[PDB]
Every structure is written in C-alpha cells, then in structure tokens.
Design a binder for these strands. Structure first.
Length: 91
DNA sequence: AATAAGCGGAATGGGG
DNA sequence: TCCCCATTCCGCTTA
C-alpha cells in the first residue's frame, strides 16, 4: 500500500488537488496545505487506504509528525507547511 | 471566549 | 514474535 508521503508527493506532481495542497519552494521540497480545503484531501487519503473511520487532517498530520525522526517529511515553521527530504524528492 | 494549528503519549490496528 | 506503517483517541499548548 502507498505510504502517506508518497501519496502527497504524487498529488503535488499530478496537480489533481491544487486547491488543497501546493508547492511553496519546489526546488527545496517545501509544500503547504490549504486551511479551508485540506479536509477534502485528508478524506481522499483515508478512502484510498480503506480505513475504518473517516480520515481528518488532524489524524493525517499526526502520521506526518512520525516522519520527523526518519526524515522523509519535516514540519516547517510556517502555517500548514512541511518539507520532503532530498532522498524522497530524488526517488 | 471562539477558532485553529501544533504537539505527542498511548492504545489499537496492518501486513508482513 | 515483533517490526512496519500507520490510525485512533485523548489531553495539553500556542496563536
């Protein structure tokens, strides 16, 4: 099954939910969620995963925080903004 | 206060 | 057995 970070990178590459997520500095791998439209993207993640409950942005961000130690995605000190690792972007 | 983002410990669930 | 990769629940903190 797809991993969360790859789901997000795939969306940014396809442009399919441009009102929910976007690059801030694509060369650096920084991206940002929409305050008003992030829940539709969270819903899509949960449905893709076949999870029992409806996915929320809060639960999705709880999973995102677990990448901080291994490095795939780190939180940036800007509202709703994160950064992929060079390894993730190169692969 | 109302609203929202940010945090993470802990329990629970996936699929090996 | 026991790690993978989350999901779900809950309470607190910061803006």
């Amino acid at each position: 099954k797809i991993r969360l970070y790859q789901f997000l990178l795939d969306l940014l590459r396809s442009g399919d939910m441009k009102d929910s997520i976007w690059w801030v500095d694509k060369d650096k791998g920084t991206f940002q969620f929409s305050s008003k439209h992030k829940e539709a993207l969270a819903h899509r993640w949960g449905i893709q995963k076949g999870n029992r409950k409806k996915m929320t942005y809060q639960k999705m961000a709880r999973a995102l925080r677990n990448y901080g130690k291994t490095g795939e995605v780190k939180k940036v000190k800007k509202k709703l903004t994160y950064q992929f690792s060079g390894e993730v972007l190169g692969r």
